[PDB]
């Protein structure tokens, strides 16, 4: 069984969903953690300096 | 403070429910319960509500099917608005 097309047919699981906190479809309904804003993981908002060029 | 009754839901299916089953259909606030729909309807048109069925519509609203008592006449009620 190929890892490509034939293995894509088995994908019908719902993981990432609209997040209650930020509105992005990044709330992992299995982990109950938003990969975009951090909801469910931290009270503080998810942020990182690498989301932009170092000197900007 | 949100109101319970938004407006009459007037469609072919609604009229049939009105002529044949003495029922009135309303677009109502989706936070309203069957009981709150009954009360509100009685107070607004001075009628007696017998049963209320609800449905959260694909229009983002709640539709209510209100059956009046045999004492009241749907056709005549809706006809005064």
């Amino acid at each position: 069984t190929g890892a490509g097309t034939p293995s894509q047919g088995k994908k019908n699981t719902t993981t990432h969903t609209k997040c209650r906190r930020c509105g992005e479809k990044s709330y992992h309904t299995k982990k109950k953690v938003c990969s975009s804003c951090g909801f469910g993981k931290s009270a503080k908002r998810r942020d990182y300096e690498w989301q932009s060029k170092a000197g900007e | 403070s949100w109101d319970v009754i938004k407006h009459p839901h007037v469609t072919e299916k609604a009229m049939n429910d009105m002529d044949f089953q003495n029922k009135l259909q309303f677009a109502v606030d989706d936070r309203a319960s069957k009981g709150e729909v009954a009360d509100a309807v009685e107070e607004q048109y001075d009628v007696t509500v017998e049963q209320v069925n609800t449905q959260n519509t694909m229009d983002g609203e709640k539709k209510a099917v209100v059956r009046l008592s045999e004492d009241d006449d749907a056709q005549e009620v809706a006809s005064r608005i």
Binding site: T14, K18, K25 | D30, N56, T57, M58, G60
Partner: protein
């Protein structure tokens, strides 16, 4: 699937946004719904 009440509200909104730019807006602005979505060709959120 099984939709919650909230999921259902969002789905409804998406359906409504899927309408056309009223004809009068055409005359008024004297000359497109950039967010036109298709159930098949597209994929909504959630």
């Amino acid at each position: 699937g099984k939709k919650s009440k909230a999921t259902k509200k969002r789905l409804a909104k998406l359906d409504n946004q899927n309408s056309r730019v009223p004809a009068w807006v055409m005359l008024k602005t004297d000359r497109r719904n950039h967010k036109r979505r298709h159930w098949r060709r597209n994929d909504t959120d959630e």
